[PDB]
Every structure is written in C-alpha cells, then in structure tokens.
Amino acid sequence: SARVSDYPLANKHPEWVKTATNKTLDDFTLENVLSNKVTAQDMRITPETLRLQASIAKDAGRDRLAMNFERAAELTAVPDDRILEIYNALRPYRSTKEELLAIADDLESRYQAKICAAFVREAATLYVERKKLKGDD
C-alpha cells in the first residue's frame, strides 16, 4: 500500500513501475523503439501500477477514485475490442438481461474481473427495473 508520500511514483519509486512485458520506465527510449526492443505491447499500464495508485487515492481521501482505479486494474486484462463490446453492451436498449449476465460471467471467469462483473450484474438488475434493455425503447 502506497501513500501520498510515495507519489509521484515516477519521482519517488520509479522501480515500482514495470510494464506488462516487464520493461523499465527508462527502457522506453527512442532507440529501444527504433530497434523494436520495446513495442506497443510493452507500453500498457499494469494492474499492479493501477493498484498502487488506487492505494494513493485512498490515502488522499478519494475512495471513489480508488474504486475506479481498482476496476481499471481488472480491465487491463480485457482486450481492446472486448472493452468496446462491453461498453456498448451497457448503453441504452443494447442488450437483454441474459447477455449482460453473460458478460458478467465472462468478466469474472475469463478475466477474474470480479469487481467489474458485479458492476455489470447490478446494471442488469437495474436496467430491467428502469427499462433500458433491448426492446424497452
């Protein structure tokens, strides 16, 4: 658990910051990019980092910000296209309760995104009540 004192990570604990492929903040130089020793696949924020920031946000008195960072940590594992699919699925009149619940299961089982999975189940339940499911318009 990091705290305000530990922030900014880039300044206080740069070593705490490692990428998906496991590269250092320093490894991202023009050269390593031109020689491809580092590529787009090495430049994604890790769920670890996001969780260190949620800790700092919590220490800064921002629980909701931390919660958001928590969910974000879970989503770093979800493919770009799948993220867009989920988001669209949550928009008004797009899905059926079943499809949302199905999205939830996938999030939890395939991605271990428990937090996000419950968020989606909650939406599903409320979407029924407030009529924002496919066919409700």
Partner: protein, 551 residues
Amino acid sequence: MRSKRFEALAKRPVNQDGFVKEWIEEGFIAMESPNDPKPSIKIVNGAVTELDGKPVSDFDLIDHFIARYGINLNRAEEVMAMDSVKLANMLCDPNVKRSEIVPLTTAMTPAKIVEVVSHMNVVEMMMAMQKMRARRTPSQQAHVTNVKDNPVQIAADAAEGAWRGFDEQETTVAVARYAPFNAIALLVGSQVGRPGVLTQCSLEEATELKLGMLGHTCYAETISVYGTEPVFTDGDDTPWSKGFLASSYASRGLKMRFTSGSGSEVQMGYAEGKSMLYLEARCIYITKAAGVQGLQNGSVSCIGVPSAVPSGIRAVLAENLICSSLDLECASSNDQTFTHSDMRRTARLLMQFLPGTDFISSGYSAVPNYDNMFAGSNEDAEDFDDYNVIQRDLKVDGGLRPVREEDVIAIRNKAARALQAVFAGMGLPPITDEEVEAATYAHGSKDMPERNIVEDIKFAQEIINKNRNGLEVVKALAQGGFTDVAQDMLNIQKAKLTGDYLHTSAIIVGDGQVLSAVNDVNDYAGPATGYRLQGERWEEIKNIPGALDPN
C-alpha cells in the same frame, strides 16, 4: 415619435442575445427553483432508502448510482442536520481549511449542497472557489480547431497555444472521418509548443475511446453525463455505461474527466421540472460516484440556456463551486459563446478567472472564433492581448503569458515541418512547403491553402481501420529529423505507464513533472497564504507588449 436614446440602445450587441422569462414547469430557471427537492437522507443498514424526499422505490438510474456510490453515508445524516447557512459560511471563511470542508461536502446530498451554495452571492462564491479549487496552481485549456479540419493549421495553432501557456488543448472535427488527423496534428503541435501539454479529440464516446487506444490522444474530457434519466438516455448512456467507460480509460493509462453543465436537460427536452442547478448537481454527483477525478462543467456548450434567465451566470459559478467543493478537479467552462457583448462575456469569465480554478477555461479558443468548431468560445485568439492585460491589471494569474511574434512564428513553423515529416513518414497525403509556410503565418483557415479533403478523409479512416498507432508517429518524427519531438512523444507515453497523471487535476509541467492536487495541494488560508502570483511568473505577466520605459 422615437427617443434617440433608446434607438442607440436598441442597436447594442447585447440586445441580440437570447433572453427569456423563467419557465418553472420546463425547468427553465437557473437555480433556487420551487420545484427542487428539499434535502433529506434516510439510511437503513448502510443503504439509502430515501434521497432528497425521494423513496428508493422510485429511484431512477441516477438516484440509484448517486445513492450507492456518490455520498459518504458514514457522515451523511450528520451533515444533513447541519445548518446550510453555517456551511456556506464555512466555504467562504478564509479560516476554515479545505481539508475540514471536503469530509462534510462529500457527505451531502445533491439538494443539500445546492441549498448551501445558493445562500451565496458571487463574491462569496469566488472567495470560496480560491480555497476549494483542488490544485493549488490554476491552469488553462484551449480549443485548437478550424472549419476545414486542416491538419497543418491545427499543428501550428496547437504549438502556439502551448507556447502561450495552455496546459491542456482540445480539438474536434467538422467532418468526423477527419478525427485521426486532427488528433495527431494536435498532439504533435502541442508537444512542440511545450512537452507535457495534454491533448484530446472530442468525438462520439466509442470512437474517442478507440482513438485513445491507438495512442493519438493524451486524455479525454467530453465523456458526458446528464441530470435526468430520459436525457441521459438520448445521450446514449447510463450511469453504469459511463462509469464503465471511465474505468476503461484508466485501464489504458489515460487521464479523463466527465463533462456536464447547467441547461443540458432543458436543451434536450426533459428537465423534469427541476432547476438547472439541481440537475447539474446530480451530474456532479454522478461524476463523484463513478470514481472520475474531475469534471468539465459551468454550463459549457449549453451556456445559452441558463444565461437567458435570471441569475444564470451566478448559477454557473455555483456549479463550478459545487464541483470543487466535492473534491473534484474542475475545468470551468468559459469555452462557449453566449453573447454578442464584450462586457457581458467578460463578466461571465471573471467569475472563474479572478479566484482561479483547475482550468480557468476548459476551452479558450486558441484560434479566431470563425475557426472554432465548438461553435465559438467565450474567448478567442483575438482576445489574447486583452487577457494578458487583465492579468497585469489585477495581478491575477490567468495561466497565460505575453509572447513574441518571432518566437510564435518559429514554434509554429517547427510544428508544421514536424507534422509534414510525420505525414511523409506514415505515407499520408503530403504536406507541401506552401502549406507549412502558410500555417506558420496564418491567423485562421482563411490563410490556409485548400486541401484534398476527400483524400485526407480516406487516409484518416485507414489509420483507424488498419489500427495504425502512435508509434508510427514517433518513428516518422525520428526518421524525419525530429528526434527531440519523438522523444517528447515518448515521454508523454511513459506518463500513461506510471499513472501519476491520472490523479485529480494532474497536468505535466517543466520536465515531465506531474502537477496534481496530490503533490500540489491547495492550502488557502486567507491573505498571504495559498497560491500567489509573484516571482518570475509575475515578471512574465507584467511584460506585455506596449509597455514603454519612461526614462
């Protein structure tokens, strides 16, 4: 027989503005409406059963979202019992710390907090905003667009904006399909003006997210939220879809905030008989609930609705105050046209300018208004000298600075050549030397050579369809002889990896140094405390053009 006095007054620009008489039934009232709910909170077993006179059995998605995530239920009932006048007093009392305030406000209900600020006049509101603003240092945001979605111009104007002081810049498109080009131009120009300047491209949600995924933007701001369920619906989202979208941006290492603003529900048909302030309050709480760090409000694009009615501009400042008080970064509008009068728009601007906010303007037009694709900003390129003069007059840091033509010309040119090299490298419709020089000395698109829109539109879509990411831009720059700019682009990308700039009010200054509410905590405690314009910054603000030496 006509009175010449009234004929002269009838020709006045301000009389061209749209004014209306309050229409309480359709929510066409800025604030303090009689249909607005009385503050109330009823909690059972850690779950709200009543919110502002409304029973949980009647909650809409907004009520549900707010009740469950937007209010600190631990102190909710305690604060509800507190006297609203006493609280409003605490907001402007220079001796009540911001850190003492936040725990109380973040526990208030939408109606409660609105009741509090409504006991205030604009002078007290400003006195409070200087203390409630999350980041200690105030900042500015500019619009960088043009009617032709011309990429060469965008790059140049962006470089100038960055040079004049803007720490956040935003572009958008006349023709959607152009987006990728605008975004890249904006991002390239900005970094040339000042490495660290964050950039955004305002598009339809799904589209903007993908553009951020491809690496052509630094953050996103126009991630909309609304005050009523039916309007949120036509907005094509729910509190949950937006909350999810907010976490998605963060998972890619991108800073973001929501956008709202008084009058949108009215503009979209369903105000549900509530005042613009109450409904905006719900948006502010929707934002807090989602875990989003900041919010762009203060009417923004619907500024014409609250300004048409009594106390409209006072309501705009009040919503900015609700935002900051709720411990959220606030990009305080002052980015949209609402009047033909210079006097009138100046008054509206000073409400945030004087006390200072995270972003005094969330869209000061860095190009003349004829090129502003958000249908006009409350300030534009032609007001630059006046803005620096007001800064000098009142010794107020407006976030900008006087600049030399020679410097502007240089930076604008370097930004045109840089983008030219980017376009050549990525094999995009070429940027000719004519376009480069044109962009170097232009004031707007009128000064720019006509481009092959149909051709650009093609390659623009290709960047999307073939998922061409920002690395292609970094390499094009490097091989184009712009090692420095490529590195800078790289450094901005490294910021996304660390997550520091995802915190409240964060911007990047100096040498890749994040400046947020976390490491730049506002510590206002009355005169001679908190942020004060001084030192070299003051010297910078003082040296405006035309200042002659009497000797």
